[PDB]
């Protein structure tokens, strides 16, 4: 839910486009 170091939320190629810090 943001952006950072450890990502969020992974898309269905398992690739996330979100972080959190």
Same mark, same amino acid.
């Given at each position: *839910? @943001?952006? @950072?170091?450890?990502?969020?939320?992974?898309? *269905? &190629? @398992?690739?996330? &486009?979100?972080?959190?810090?």
């Amino acid at each position: *839910g @943001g952006a @950072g170091h450890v990502p969020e939320y992974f898309v *269905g &190629i @398992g690739t996330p &486009i979100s972080f959190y810090g």
